[PDB]
Each structure stands twice: as structure tokens, then as C-alpha cells.
Design a binder for these strands. Structure first.
Ligand code: GTP
Ligand code: MG
Lengths: 1068, 174, 326
DNA sequence: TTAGTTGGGGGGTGACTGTTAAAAGTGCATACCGAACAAAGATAAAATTT
DNA sequence: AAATTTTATCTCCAGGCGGTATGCACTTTTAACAGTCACCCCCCAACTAA
């Protein structure tokens, strides 16, 4: 075959030609850099051509032997790319991108030292010398001096390669010469324990006596307020749990399994529909559609990965390593779980982009912790630490949980760093577009095989508000109808949205604590912002111990659910519902030409309003029923000012009456000799009728209505229904049940009670203001001085307004006549509360209007004139009641206005030690992300270049300071209540405990208030502000004005704070 | 087309005119000289060429540029739109033809093995427009075995081909 | 800023234009903001009947004196035309009124849509808020609410040059084409009757007539063109598919079609409806690739009617009340 | 559904090696538009203009 | 620098408009002529694996 012979010869020739050309001068990764400098290029050439196996190590020595503002968005993205390539273990891609960016004149200016250091460390971990030398040539060509990390990479490479000590002693003698310290080498944050071990071995080979600095005994806080808490001398009775060790270990294992799963399934509490043919058909169709969507999503993800890799191969940045972080199945399941819970009305594009990226990070962190091998360390450490909180187990020396956790030997704790905001938004957008494009459904679901054309499940529709437009993703109506038809019995929650089943991990630093694996922010802010975290991490480590201990103490409180209240609530929800009590009604019990359109619009609005309340109630009730016979814990964290809030959103003690009724303590305490009285007083307080009478009269009234209490306890719904008339109906019923069980018992003193008792502070903000000013009249007004009957300002304001209104209506104007008996405490409470914080009359009117709207007996047609009248008269009554409070408010406002005028934001430090800062700035620019569907507009948080906003800084200063002083008091009260063995949980200004320990908790509160306010808070604030801001003499005159304002604090009055200890109604 | 050749040509570059000035003389200088060698000689001359000649050539280039821009401005006005639409359609056709040519050549350069030959083609080769008519008229074994050999031999050539494409990164070609 | 007319020859010309209607020329002429009353004086001299609606109380006593002994031809009412029928729901303060109350007080009776023009309204648009008053009237007209409940009310009011050009934009002039032009060209028949520069009119503020010569010289640089335009609601505006119940969907469709101007109709139809965009585009008689700026208003009406008339699909729109206030 | 295969012919153009300058491409930045309607009344600091 | 115009309106519990046009700065690409050789497409049949 002459033809075949010619073909073989030609193919052989072409193969040889291609091979030679590829070898000298296709998608091939680039290794050897292209050097600009003539001398450096010649040096690399002679280094490569000197030997077939070039002497890379001594050239590495010689390369560094001679030693001859905020980053841009693109640099931020490139740094994240290079750091992620290390985690993903894709080094050739990072090297290729680095050589490509170093090659061209314009993109060489982008690279900085950190990228070279990261690639150098990545090559060092594998012990590769040639690529390390290439990167060193690159960084020397760029005109940069190697830092400590560049020497660490070389030392790690030499240690891993086990090469001769000669280059090692040369390197260390230089490191001495240049001034670098070997001690600073082992404290670098950007290092792992394996790398430290390797560099330690390398150093030990040369210097045998090299010793790491010895460990130090843990420091102890020595502040004036916290000295008593951390004193090692005294008598202590720390509370212990009521469960054996094995039960706690089993619960810890269950919680670990739940968190590793990342999901939990809760059986829905809806009325189970009868399984007819229609439901079965709907469920079958749903299952088939879900399977098809899963396969389509898998294929789309693979195609996107291929495209992004090809884009990277051409020398441009993309999201390929970020996609490589997680397994395909996990991403597909996350995307299918997002679709399952999409509301019928729809969700915004930006919100979906934010949610999808946030879910990816948490699973990545959990997977990294699982793979690294810290799960076993945590499992070994917790099983020993749990001996402190067990009834049968014993500890050699009692101590706070954090102290025992540290003293037991703390496991090495490392956590991942957040991605840059542009990367987060781009990843979210990409995932959202993939989800939109992949899913498809048949056109006519109800009619079988009517047509075979396929329509998308999700649609992109613009929504117009005023001039502005917003993109919205909305489901197909047929899919929503199918979902309603199916009526599946399962609900799905995220792991971090469900109360923990095991004691919370102790807070040990601003980076650890709360959930065992998932990351929790110490301060809840927006993703971009980082100023608060920086201020927290730049302070002495021992300053934050009080806050961490208070949060840990609040975290470790066992809870439980109430059976009878939950049963009654479920009965109303499953049936037609009771809207008056608070149980939302089913949509079925709905009201259901221009007149017809108006009627339809009203009915639609009513249905839309009902449908959200029912869904929220459904979620809460399903969660409550899932935890029927279990003990659960709720972790806590602060906002940017100090106030403490629980982490789980749905079910916690900060919600409405139903949520607070469904919860009770898991530890029983005998009522003692003074418990039944406190239970009855709590019942009367919950009723709300006797809100202005001494304790004796409240107890007497509780005795008087005993028949109604015992009737409502025995037959809740079929009786006289006396409990329905209370201000809080559901909590009143639970208190009635507890009181009935107590009295019917043989010995009421021996009855154990699991019901918390609330103690509230009256006019807390005005109380703090009066304490700061030490005013006598103000303190006497807000119950800061001994008295026999409670006193409140809000009732006096209503009396004065009523007097003026009666005199006005005597002259006969219509609006004053209409409001005959609608001047109550509730309508004028929040205005007089917030006048001292700086409320405007435009603001005061929108509060009084909102209050008058919901009265339902006042004619709902005169609101516009009634609000305008009520706020003029309230301000006509409030001109001369508060003097020292207004003086302090004026001083604070003036100081913040002038500080904000100089170009810096306001900062202060809480008396405990937590630093605070106000993040109000004018938003100059917003970024955009172009894409296939639409351009997402998102705010860039953390831009410190913009100027401060004087209006917001001046208005927000008076409230935040008082709120910080409010949370410092609770944390002092909680810390000193722990030592006496009490159980303490709090709701901002209301403190809860068992029925027996209310007297002790009251004593502790009254003592710690005086201890907190004995210190000169105002003078310390003035000194701190003077030192922080007026120190710079750059602008002499403005700084002089600022110092004159700052060095003029209001003078105190004449009021001894010791009388607070003898006030009965300071907290009641 | 008619409009294609009607479109004026741009002024020729200064170095090109410099080359054209001494190209005939260099052709007579060495008959054995080739195009590449002559071009490299002219490049060397431009390396040693003075700058006054460059300036006068640049002035002439400006003169020709004004002439050409005025002429093309005149020409672009008087044309009818239909021939313009035909010209634009045919220029994008030419661009697509160029892209297809480049793709075909890149495929040939990347060691493309021969496709299975047909028996009717082997018969044409054995028999040896008229030729096509004769072989078609005659149309109305060994090649099959060779095609069977081609199937057995070229299939593992595809299998052999993949590893280089993996090594050279051309995964998308698969 | 109010811009009441004062000139006498202009008043005569405007009176002649207003009363030039052939059939029963003296319609009941509701006049918005007559102010000094030279225009109403000319109208009354020409034999017409005028009811004055003042937002300003001060002109009320003055105008009554002009109307004294005029045989009930002049009826002063303290009302604002653009504040008719507030949508807030409280007690109606004197500066606003109610369409039903005013029309019962004047004795005007409701007239069916297919019948002839019942009334005529003259005046001037708000100086700065023309956009807002064109939208309010359009919602009132499409829903058959407010004054348009009583038939087909004629509106002849001066409008500015820029808004006149924006309102009369066409597919031939795409840079100004938008939603308001489409809806107003579909709803009514707009014609131009007179033209007048700003210099002829005089501006009265709260302080009084503009006595500033420097501002007058500055106003000389602020000249524009005021067009007197006449709107007549179209008899066949409402059809079986386009009814006062379905105007929200059409409005949303029009606002969506101009959200991304440089896009084919298929791209918007894919988002708006689950049906086949190709079939609808073929039915209405358009090519596959058609830009929205090249679409006449009647083509938009035909598209909406074609989508609504489809009976095979149980779900024909994705717009819902949820997309409002979100 | 279609690009790829073999024969004798023919045709157009790719490479080459060369500088030059105009034309296209790419990333960033700012400015203007939509003024989806929907009563009214209040007060003083931020904001722009002459 | 004073005046007039415009704007936000106590705080916390984690929120942000989208599209089109024009401009600037720098890199990348393309056509200008040379002559000779090489390569691919026709020219029309014939057909075949992607
Ligand atoms: N600035 C501001 N602070 C509030 C607001 N609502 C509550 N607070 C703070 O929360 C504290 C407690 O508020 P509440 O328990 O609701 O009411 P109160 O002021 O304590 O008065 P009582 O209801 O009698 O206990 C107050 O001292 C305020 O400082 C508010 O709307 N604005
Ligand atoms: Mg309180």
C-alpha cells in the first residue's frame, strides 16, 4: 500500500516537527519567568545553562545574600485567588497566573510582596527548590526586599529536603546580620504547626540549644470592678447541672452529628391531610421533577467548571479554585434545598446572591476542620471538660468554665479568614444564575402529556418602586400550586438556626465560642464591616474577660418546653384559630366595575397579611413540638454596643407571649418559705391590673381572685376564661397552672418549681441618666430613692395632658372632644421615653399616630389631627421636667458634632473594658457587577476613605452610651449572681430567675448598680476623648475648640447612691 | 466584486517604499539572493539608514495620506447603499472563510490522522471532470480490508492521540 | 409657581378658541385657577357659563363681585382640580373636595361612555409637576374613577415644551419614546390649538405679581413655548379584554418593556409570560427580531389583547399584587 | 445533518521578513434617564449659589 | 461669606436600583508592498463517519 506507506511517513514527520517546535518555543502551563532586567535575565540564563542539574540551593542563598493604603479591588481578588489555590492544592495554576502577570508591563504593577510570599510558601511545603528559586528571581526583579516570611519559606524548604547544614548556617548568619530575629519567626500568624515543626527541626540541626519561649501562666483581670469576681480567696458555690456525665457525653455526640450534617428535618405541625389520590399524584410528580433538577444541576456545574478553567488558562482571573473547594454533591444539595424553600411571592436577586455565598463558606469551614483533624481533638477535650458541669463527676478545684478549659490544655485553634466582598458577591451571582438556568419543568403539570414544551421554573421580573427598579426572581405559578397540593409533612432548618442539644463551647477569644464548628461573630454587623473586630483584637487580652465570662454564663442555662400550653396552642392552630389570643387563623377563614376591583383588592390584602403570620407561627410551633422531651441550650453574642442577644432566631425567650410561655427552666428548685408569695405577685404583674399598687395589695388581690385562678387552671378553654382578659394571656395561664399545682399540694413549701420569675426596671434610661448626674429630683422621680408606693413619670405626663385636653375641650373644639378617655400611659410612653434621646416633633407625631391607629375604638378618621394635637401638648408639657438629663444630652451631642467635624468617628470604652465605635459615614459610591442576567448594585462596607456623617453621629451618640451602661450593669449582676449559685437569664432590662432566689437577685442588682455608678464615668470619658482626638496638634484652633468643649463636663448634684439598696421598687 | 476592487488601497508605508527603492538594485546585485535574504539586507540598511531620508519619506507619507483620505471621503459618498450591503455581506463571508481556513490548518498541524478511505475511491485510484464521469459510468475487497485495517489501526491512533492532547492541554478538542 | 393670564387680546383669542365648538358652544366651562378673572370675564362676555375652582381663598371674594348680577352664570367654588378625590381616606379638608359631591352640587348627571361629551374643563397644568398630574389623570381615566366616572370629560390645558415633546414622541423619534406617551396616545386624541411664549403670561407668587426687573431680564433667558393641547377620551379605548380590572397588568407590561430599551420583544415576553413568545409574535404580525422602540402603541395594545385572549393556558401572566410595593 | 474522502486537472492565497502607522479592543470612570399616581402639615441643619 | 435651596426627621436586633451613553488611557491587531515557494480549494462526480 504505497498510500499507507506515504501516510505513515508524513505522520511521523509532522509528529517530530510539532515535538521540536513545542519543546523550544496549545495549552501549556508556564514555569520559567520572563525577566525584564538585562542583568537578572542573564543571571537566570547562566544559572539554567550552568549545569544540567543547576545548584539551586546556593543560588537561593545568593539571591537574598546581596539584598540589593488599602489594596485595589483587583489586587484583593488576586490575593484571594492565590491564597485559595494553596488550600485547593492547585499550585501550577497560581504559578502560571503569576508568570503571566509578571510578564506584561501593565499587569506587573498589580503584583505585591504578599502574592510572591504565598506562592513561595506553597512551593516550600512540597520542598521544591527550582520553582522557589524562580519566584525569588521574580521578587528580586520586581525590586522588593524579602521579609521574614520569605526566609521562613526557604528554611522550611531546607528542613523538608534534609539538605546539608552549610546553606542553613549561611542563612541564619545572614538573618542575624540583616537584623531579623529567629524568635519573631515562630510567632508569625500566617504559619501552621507543621511548618513551625519543620523550621524548628531545620534550626535545631544547626543550633542545638534553640529553645522556644517558655509558656506563661494565664493572666487574670485586675480591674476595680472585676477584682472580686476573679479573686481566688473566698467561699464559692458554683451551680452544677442535674444530669450524669454519660448523658451529657451522648448529647454532645448528637449535637456534633447534627452540626456535621448541616441540616435537620422537623415534622410539620399542620393538620395532616387525608392521603387521597390527588396528594399521591402530586408527590409523585414532585419527586420526578426533583430528580431531573438534580441531574441538570450536576451537568451545568461541570460545564461551568470547564469554562472557568479554560478562562484561567488564558491568563485572567476567575472563580475556578473557589468552585473546587466543595464537592459537587454538596453544592447540588445546597442549591436544591434553596429552591425547595423559595416563597411564592419571590426573592430579590441580591438577597439570593448574598445567601448562596454565605452558605458555601460555612460548609467549607466545617469540611476543612473535619479534614485537618481537629474534630478528634475537640472530642477528646470536651469529654474531659464536661466533668465541671456534671452532678456525679467532681473536679479538683472549682473554677469558671473558661478557666478550666484553658487549664486543661487548650487545643490548637485555627480558623479560616473571610473572602473579600467582591468574590462573595460574584460567587453568589454565579450560583444564582446557574440555579435559574438549570431547572426546567413541563408546561402543563395538571394535564398529563398535554404538551411537551418545557418552561423555566424561575423567572426574572423587574419590580418598580417609584422611579427605581429592582430585579426579582419569582417561581412559576404551576409549581406553587403543585407544592400546595402535595402538602409534604417535613420542614428543613439550618444547623445554626436550631437550639443546640449540648452545653455551648466556652468563649476563650474573639475568634472562638458558641457553636462547636460553625463560625459565630462576637459582634453582629454587616459582612463587609471590620472596624469593631479590629478594635476588639488590638486591646490587652485580659480586658475582655468580663464580657466573655458573662456571655458564657448566659450560654449555659438548660431549658425545656411546657406541655399543657403547647397542647392548647396546637389545638387552636389546627382548628379555625384564635386571632384575639395570638394564634393566626388558617387562610380558609378569609373574608373571600371599580367597586368589584376595590373589594377584590381589600380581600387580597387581608389574605396576604394573614399568610405571613401563619407561616411564621408554623415554623415556631414545629420547632417547639420537635423539642418536646429534650433539654436544649441557646448561645449568646452582642451587638456593636454591648447588649446581649441569643443566636437562634426562631425559638428563643425574646419573642412574643407564646414564645415566652412555651419555655421553662429545666432545673427544679423548692419554693422555700417565700416562693408562693413571689408566684402570686408574678401572676398579678402579668395580669397588669394592679400596676400602681404596693406588693401587699398585689398579693391580697391574688388571694381575692383565687377562685378564678383555680377555675382557669383546671378547665382552660371551657371555663369562665378569666385568663383571656389579662394583658399577657398565655404567660398568665402558665402561672395559674403553677400556682394551682403549688396550693393543691400537701406541702406547698416542698413543691419544686421550674418557672422563671421576671423582675423589671422602670424607666431604665432615665434611671441611668439620674445616676450619672446624681440629681435628687430625677432620682426621686424614677424610684431611685426609698418610697412606699411606686412612682412613674409617664403617668404624670398623661395627667397633665389630660388636664390640658379637658380645659381645651371645655371651649369645644372637635378633636379635643373626641378623645375623651383615650389619654393613657401607653399613648404617651414612648414619646417621653425618647425626648431625652433627641426625638423630633415630626418623629413624635408618627409614634402617636401609630399608637392611636390600633385602638380599634377610637374613630379611625381623626388620626391626622389627633396626632398633631397630642404631640403639641406633650411638648407643651415636657419643657421643664428634665434638667440634668438634658444638660448631659447637650454636652454629649456637642462633643460628637465637633469630633465628627474634624473628620473622625466617635469612640469610647465601656467601664468593663469593651471598646465601642460608631460606624456612620457618607456613602460616596456603590459598586456594580456586570453579568449575564443583570448588574447587581451592592454597598461596599468597610471603606474608611469616606467622610463621617455629622447628623447621624450627633443623633446616635446619646442612646448608644446609655445602652452600653445598661449592658455593663446586667453583666456585672450576672457575674456576681453566678457565685451564689443562682440561675440567671436576662431580656435587656428584665432579669429572670427561679421563684425562690428573687430576694438574693434583687440584693445583687441593687449592690452592683451602686458599684457601677460609684466610678466617675463622665470624667473618664472626657479624659479618653481628650487623649484620643485632641492629641494631634495638626489643626491648632479646631483642636483648641474641641478641647474646650471636652474639658467642660456637667457638674454633679447631691445624691448618695447608697439609698438604692433600700429601694423596694427600683426593680420590680 | 466590482465594489471590492473599486475600494481604494491605503498609502504604502515608508519602510515599504524604502525597500522598493533598493529592491531592484539588490536583485541585480546577487542573482542567487532570495526574498528573505534581500529583506534582511534591506532591514540592515534601515538600521544603518540616515534620519533625513526617514523625515522626507514621512513627509511624503503625510502627503499621500491627505490625498488618500480626501479620495476615500469622496468615494464613500457617491456609492449606492445596496452595493454597500452586498460588500459588507461578502466581507463577513471572507472573514468567516479565513476563520474556517485557520481552524482547518490548525487541525492539520495538530497531527490529524487520515479518515477511513472509501472503496469507491480506491477503485478510482486503481483505474486512474472527464475522469469523474468515466469512473461514475463504470461504477453503475482489498479496500474493505484496508478500511477494516484502517478501523483497527486508526482507532488506537485516536486513543494514542489523547495523551498528547492531555499533555499539551487541548482537552476541549476531545 | 402659578402663571395666571392677564393680557386682554390673548384672553379674547383664548375665549374664541374655547367657545369655537360648533354644537351648543356654551358648554359649562369649569375653569382651573382663573385668579384675577380676566379670562373668565372674557368667557362670560362671550356668552358662556363658568364655574371657578380656586385653590387660593383670597381670589374668592374678588371674583364674586365681578359675578354680581350675572344671572347665575358665575358660580365660585373653592376646589382644586388636581386634588380631587384624595386616596388617603381621612376627612376631606376644604382645599380638596369630592368628585361626587361637586358633581351633585353642580347638578351634573353621569353619562354613559358611548355617549357624547358631557363637559369641558380648561386651565393650566402645574408649572413644575406636569409628570405627576399626567399620571394621576391616566390612572383616573383607565380605571373610570374620579371625574371620568361621569362620561368623557374634555380637558384643554397649557403644557410645557419639553413635556409636549416627550408626550408626542413616536417610534420615528426613539430617544424620547416612553410609557407615558404610549398610554396617552392610546387613551386619547391629542391636538394642538394655540402656541404662546412664556413672556405673554405673568407669574403670581405668594408674595404677589413678579415686580423684579432683574428676574424679568433673567426670565427673558428663561423663555419657553407653552402649547395649548386638547384631550378627548377615545370611544373604543375599552374592549372586552382591556377592562378597568386589567389595566394594572398592561401598565406593568409597558413599564417592563421600557426598562431595557435596546432589547427585542421576545426577551421581555419570555420574562413576562409562560406562553410561547414565538406564537404570540407571529399572531400579532411582527418579525421574530423586533425592538421595542420600533413598536407603535396600537401594536402594544394588540399584543396585550392577544396574550389575554388566549384560553388554552390556565396561567397567562406572571404579574401579581405581590410585585407592588416591593 | 453534514464535513471528509480520490482521481486527473485547474484556481486562489498561506507562509516568508521587514517596519509603520492606523484601527480595533479592554478596563475603568462619570453622568443622565426612568420621574407607576396616590392632600394636608412641621423645623433646622446640611447643601448649593453668587 | 452670606444667602437661599434642599433634605432628613433618637437608637439596636446583619442590607445594597438598573440601563445607556461618552470619555480616557493603554495594549493588540491589521493592512500597507516584495518575490518565490508551498498549500488548500475547487470540479464533480463518488460516499461516511462523526
Ligand atoms: N432610644 C430608644 N430607647 C428605647 C426604646 N425603647 C426602649 N428603649 C430603652 O429600653 C429601656 C427599657 O424600655 P421598656 O422596658 O420597654 O420601658 P421602660 O422605659 O423600662 O419603662 P417601663 O415600661 O415602665 O418599664 C428604656 O430605658 C430605653 O432606654 C426606643 O424606642 N428608643
Ligand atoms: Mg423596664
Amino acid at each position: 500500500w504505497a498510500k499507507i506507506l506515504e501516510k505513515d511517513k508524513r505522520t511521523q514527520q509532522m509528529r517530530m516537527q510539532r515535538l521540536k517546535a513545542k519543546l523550544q518555543m496549545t495549552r501549556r502551563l508556564q514555569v520559567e519567568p520572563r525577566l525584564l532586567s538585562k542583568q537578572m535575565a542573564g543571571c537566570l540564563e547562566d544559572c539554567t545553562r550552568q549545569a544540567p542539574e543547576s545548584p539551586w540551593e546556593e543560588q537561593l542563598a545568593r539571591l537574598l545574600q546581596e539584598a540589593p493604603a488599602q489594596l485595589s479591588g483587583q489586587q484583593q481578588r488576586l490575593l484571594a485567588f492565590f491564597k485559595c489555590c494553596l488550600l485547593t492544592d492547585q499550585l501550577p495554576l497560581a504559578h502560571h497566573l503569576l508568570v503571566v502577570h509578571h510578564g506584561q508591563r501593565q499587569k506587573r504593577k498589580l503584583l505585591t510582596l504578599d502574592m510572591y510570599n504565598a506562592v513561595m510558601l506553597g512551593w516550600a511545603r512540597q520542598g521544591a527548590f527550582k520553582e522557589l528559586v524562580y519566584v525569588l528571581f521574580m521578587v528580586k526583579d520586581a525590586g522588593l526586599t524579602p521579609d521574614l516570611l520569605s526566609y521562613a519559606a526557604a528554611l522550611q524548604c531546607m528542613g523538608r529536603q534534609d539538605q546539608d547544614a552549610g546553606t542553613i548556617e549561611r542563612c541564619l548568619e545572614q538573618m542575624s546580620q540583616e537584623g531579623l530575629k529567629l524568635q519573631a519567626l515562630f510567632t508569625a500568624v500566617l504559619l501552621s504547626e507543621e511548618d513551625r515543626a519543620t523550621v524548628l527541626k531545620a534550626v535545631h540541626k544547626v543550633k542545638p540549644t534553640f529553645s522556644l519561649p517558655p509558656q506563661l501562666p494565664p493572666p487574670v483581670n485586675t480591674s476595680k470592678l472585676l477584682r472580686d469576681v476573679y479573686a481566688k480567696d473566698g467561699r464559692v458555690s458554683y451551680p452544677k447541672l442535674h444530669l450524669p456525665l454519660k448523658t451529657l457525653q451522648c448529647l454532645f455526640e448528637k449535637q456534633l452529628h447534627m452540626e456535621l450534617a448541616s441540616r435537620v428535618c422537623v415534622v410539620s405541625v399542620e393538620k395532616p391531610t387525608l392521603p387521597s389520590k390527588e396528594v399521591k399524584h402530586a408527590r409523585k410528580t414532585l419527586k420526578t421533577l426533583r430528580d431531573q433538577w438534580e441531574k441538570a444541576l450536576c451537568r451545568a456545574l461541570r460545564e461551568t467548571k470547564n469554562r472557568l478553567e479554560r478562562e484561567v488558562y488564558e491568563g485572567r482571573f476567575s472563580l475556578y479554585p473557589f468552585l473546587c473547594l466543595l464537592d459537587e454533591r454538596e453544592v447540588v444539595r445546597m442549591l436544591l434545598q434553596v429552591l425547595q424553600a423559595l416563597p411564592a411571592q419571590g426573592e430579590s436577586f441580591t438577597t439570593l446572591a448574598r445567601e448562596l455565598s454565605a452558605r458555601t463558606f460555612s460548609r467549607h469551614v466545617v469540611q476543612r476542620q473535619r479534614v485537618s483533624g481537629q474534630v478528634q481533638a475537640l472530642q477528646n477535650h470536651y469529654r474531659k471538660y464536661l466533668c465541671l458541669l456534671a452532678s456525679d463527676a467532681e473536679v479538683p478545684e472549682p473554677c469558671l468554665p473558661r478557666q478550666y478549659w484553658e487549664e486543661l490544655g487548650a487545643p490548637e485553634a485555627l480558623r479560616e479568614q473571610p473572602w473579600p466582598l467582591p468574590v462573595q458577591m460574584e460567587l453568589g451571582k454565579l450560583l444564582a444564575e446557574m440555579l435559574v438556568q438549570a431547572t426546567q419543568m413541563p408546561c402543563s403539570l395538571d394535564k398529563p402529556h398535554r404538551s411537551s414544551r418545557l418552561v423555566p421554573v424561575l423567572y426574572h421580573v423587574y419590580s418598580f418602586r417609584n422611579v427605581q427598579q429592582i430585579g426579582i426572581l419569582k417561581p412559576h405559578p404551576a409549581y406553587v400550586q403543585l407544592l400546595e397540593k402535595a402538602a409534604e409533612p417535613t420542614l428543613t432548618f439550618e444547623a445554626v438556626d436550631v437550639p443546640m442539644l449540648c452545653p455551648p463551647l466556652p468563649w476563650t477569644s474573639p475568634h472562638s465560642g458558641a457553636f462547636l464548628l460553625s463560625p459565630t461573630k462576637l459582634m453582629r454587623t454587616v459582612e463587609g464591616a471590620t472596624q469593631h473586630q479590629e478594635l476588639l483584637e488590638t486591646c490587652p487580652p485580659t480586658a475582655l474577660h468580663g464580657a466573655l465570662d458573662a456571655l458564657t454564663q448566659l450560654g449555659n442555662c438548660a431549658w425545656r418546653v411546657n406541655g399543657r400550653v403547647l397542647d392548647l396552642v396546637l389545638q387552636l392552630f389546627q382548628a379555625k384559630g384564635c386571632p384575639q389570643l395570638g394564634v393566626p387563623a388558617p387562610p380558609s377563614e378569609a373574608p373571600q366595575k371599580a367597586e368589584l376591583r376595590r373589594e377584590l383588592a381589600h380581600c387580597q390584602k387581608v389574605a396576604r397579611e394573614m399568610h405571613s403570620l401563619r407561616a411564621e407561627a408554623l415554623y415556631r410551633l414545629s420547632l417547639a413540638q420537635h423539642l418536646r422531651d429534650r433539654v436544649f441550650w441557646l448561645p449568646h453574642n452582642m451587638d456593636f454596643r454591648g447588649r446581649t442577644y441569643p443566636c437562634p432566631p426562631h425559638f428563643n425567650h425574646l419573642g412574643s407571649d407564646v414564645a415566652r410561655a412555651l419555655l421553662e427552666f429545666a432545673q427544679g428548685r423548692p419554693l422555700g418559705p417565700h416562693g408562693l408569695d413571689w408566684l402570686k405577685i408574678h401572676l398579678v404583674n402579668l395580669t397588669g391590673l394592679k400596676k400602681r399598687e404596693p406588693l401587699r395589695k398585689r398579693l391580697a388581690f391574688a388571694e381575692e381572685v383565687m377562685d378564678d385562678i383555680l377555675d382557669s387552671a383546671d378547665q382552660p378553654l371551657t371555663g369562665r376564661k378569666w385568663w383571656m382578659g389579662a394583658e399577657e394571656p398565655w404567660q398568665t395561664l402558665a402561672c395559674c397552672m403553677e400556682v394551682a399545682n403549688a396550693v393543691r399540694a400537701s406541702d406547698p413549701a416542698a413543691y419544686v418549681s421550674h418557672l422563671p420569675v421576671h423582675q423589671d426596671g422602670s424607666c431604665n434610661g432615665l434611671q441611668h441618666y439620674a445616676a450619672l448626674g446624681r440629681d435628687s429630683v430625677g432620682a426621686a422621680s424614677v424610684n431611685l430613692e426609698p418610697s412606699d408606693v411606686p412612682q412613674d413619670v409617664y403617668s404624670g405626663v398623661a395627667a397633665q395632658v389630660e388636664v390640658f385636653r379637658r380645659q381645651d375641650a371645655q371651649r369645644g373644639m372637635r378633636v379635643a372632644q373626641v378623645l375623651e378617655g383615650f389619654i393613657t400611659r401607653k399613648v404617651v410612653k414612648q414619646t417621653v421615653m425618647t425626648v431625652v434621646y433627641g426625638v423630633t416633633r415630626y418623629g413624635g407625631r408618627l409614634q402617636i399616630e401609630k399608637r392611636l391607629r390600633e385602638l380599634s375604638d377610637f374613630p379611625q378618621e381623626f388620626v391626622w389631627e389627633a396626632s398633631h394635637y397630642l404631640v403639641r401638648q406633650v411638648f407643651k408639657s415636657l419643657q421643664e421636667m428634665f434638667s440634668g438629663t438634658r444638660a448631659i444630652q447637650h454636652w454629649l451631642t456637642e462633643s460628637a458634632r465637633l469630633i465628627s467635624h474634624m473628620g473622625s468617628v466617635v469612640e469610647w470604652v465601656t467601664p468593663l473594658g469593651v471598646p465601642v465605635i460608631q460606624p456612620y459615614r457618607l456613602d460616596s459610591k456603590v459598586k456594580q457587577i456586570g453579568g449575564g442576567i443583570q448588574s447587581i448594585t451592592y454597598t461596599h462596607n468597610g471603606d474608611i476613605s469616606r467622610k463621617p456623617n455629622t447628623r447621624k453621629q450627633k443623633n446616635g451618640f446619646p442612646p448608644n452610651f446609655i445602652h452600653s451602661l445598661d449592658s455593663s450593669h446586667m453583666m456585672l449582676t450576672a457575674l456576681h449572681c453566678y457565685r451564689k449559685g443562682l440561675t440567671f437569664v436576662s431580656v435587656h432590662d428584665c432579669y429572670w430567675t427561679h421563684a425562690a432566689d428573687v430576694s438574693v437577685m434583687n440584693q445583687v442588682c441593687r449592690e452592683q448598680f451602686v458599684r457601677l455608678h460609684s466610678e466617675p464615668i463622665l470624667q473618664d470619658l472626657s479624659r479618653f476623648l481628650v487623649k484620643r482626638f485632641c492629641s494631634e496638634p495638626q489643626k491648632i484652633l479646631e483642636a483648641s475648640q474641641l478641647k474646650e468643649t471636652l474639658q467642660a463636663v456637667p457638674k454633679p448634684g447631691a445624691f448618695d447612691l447608697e439609698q438604692v439598696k433600700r429601694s423596694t421598687y427600683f426593680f420590680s | 466584486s466590482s465594489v471590492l476592487a473599486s475600494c481604494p488601497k491605503k498609502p504604502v508605508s515608508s519602510y515599504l517604499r524604502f525597500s522598493k527603492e533598493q529592491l531592484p538594485i539588490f536583485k541585480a546585485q546577487n542573482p542567487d539572493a532570495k526574498t528573505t535574504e534581500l529583506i534582511r539586507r534591506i532591514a540592515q540598511r534601515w538600521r544603518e539608514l540616515p534620519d533625513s531620508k526617514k523625515k522626507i519619506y514621512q513627509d511624503a507619507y503625510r502627503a499621500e495620506w491627505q490625498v488618500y483620505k480626501e479620495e476615500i471621503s469622496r468615494f464613500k459618498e457617491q456609492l449606492t447603499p445596496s452595493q454597500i450591503m452586498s460588500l459588507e455581506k461578502e466581507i463577513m463571508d471572507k472573514h468567516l472563510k479565513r476563520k474556517a481556513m485557520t481552524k482547518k490548518k490548525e487541525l492539520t498541524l495538530l497531527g490529524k490522522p487520515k479518515r477511513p478511505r472509501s472503496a469507491y475511491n480506491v477503485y478510482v485510484a486503481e483505474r486512474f471532470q472527464e475522469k469523474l464521469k468515466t469512473v461514475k459510468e463504470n461504477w453503475k475487497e482489498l479496500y474493505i480490508q484496508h478500511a477494516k485495517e484502517d478501523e483497527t489501526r486508526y482507532h488506537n491512533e485516536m486513543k494514542s492521540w489523547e495523551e498528547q492532547m492531555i499533555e499539551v492541554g487541548r482537552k476541549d478538542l476531545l | 409657581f402659578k402663571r395666571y393670564v392677564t393680557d386682554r387680546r390673548l384672553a379674547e383669542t383664548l375665549a374664541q378658541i374655547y367657545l369655537g365648538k360648533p354644537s351648543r358652544p356654551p358648554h359649562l366651562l369649569l375653569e382651573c385657577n382663573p385668579g384675577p378673572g380676566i379670562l373668565t370675564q372674557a368667557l362670560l362676555e362671550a356668552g358662556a357659563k363658568v364655574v371657578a375652582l380656586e385653590s387660593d381663598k383670597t381670589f374668592i371674594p374678588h371674583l364674586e363681585s365681578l359675578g354680581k348680577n350675572l344671572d347665575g352664570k358665575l358660580r365660585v367654588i373653592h376646589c382644586d382640580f388636581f386634588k380631587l378625590d384624595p386616596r388617603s381616606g381621612g376627612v376631606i379638608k376644604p382645599p380638596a373636595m369630592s368628585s361626587r359631591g361637586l358633581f351633585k352640587n353642580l347638578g351634573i348627571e353621569a353619562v354613559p361612555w358611548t355617549a357624547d361629551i358631557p363637559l369641558k374643563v380648561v386651565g393650566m397644568f402645574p408649572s413644575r409637576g406636569e409628570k405627576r398630574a399626567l399620571w394621576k389623570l391616566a390612572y383616573d381615566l383607565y380605571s373610570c374613577t374620579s371625574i371620568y366616572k361621569f362620561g368623557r370629560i374634555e380637558v384643554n390645558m397649557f403644557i410645557g415644551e419639553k413635556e409636549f415633546q416627550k408626550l408626542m414622541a413616536d417610534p420615528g423619534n426613539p430617544d424620547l419614546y416612553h410609557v407615558l406617551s404610549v398610554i396617552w396616545q392610546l387613551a386619547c386624541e391629542i391636538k394642538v390649538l394655540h402656541m404662546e411664549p412664556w413672556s405673554s403670561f405673568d407669574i403670581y407668587t405668594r408674595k404677589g405679581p413678579l415686580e423684579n426687573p432683574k428676574r424679568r431680564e433673567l426670565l427673558d433667558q428663561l423663555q419657553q413655548k407653552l402649547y395649548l393641547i386638547q384631550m378627548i377620551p377615545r370611544q373604543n379605548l375599552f374592549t372586552k379584554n382591556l377592562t378597568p380590572m386589567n389595566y394594572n397588568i398592561f401598565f406593568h407590561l409597558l413599564k417592563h418593556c421600557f426598562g431595557r430599551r435596546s432589547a427585542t420583544v421576545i426577551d421581555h415576553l419570555r420574562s413576562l409570560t409562560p406562553l410561547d413568545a414565538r406564537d404570540i409574535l407571529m399572531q400579532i404580525g411582527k418579525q421574530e427580531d423586533e425592538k421595542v422602540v420600533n413598536m407603535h402603541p396600537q401594536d402594544f395594545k394588540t399584543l396585550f389583547e392577544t396574550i389575554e385572549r388566549s384560553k388554552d393556558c390556565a396561567y397567562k401572566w406572571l404579574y401579581d399584587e405581590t410585585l407592588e410595593d416591593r
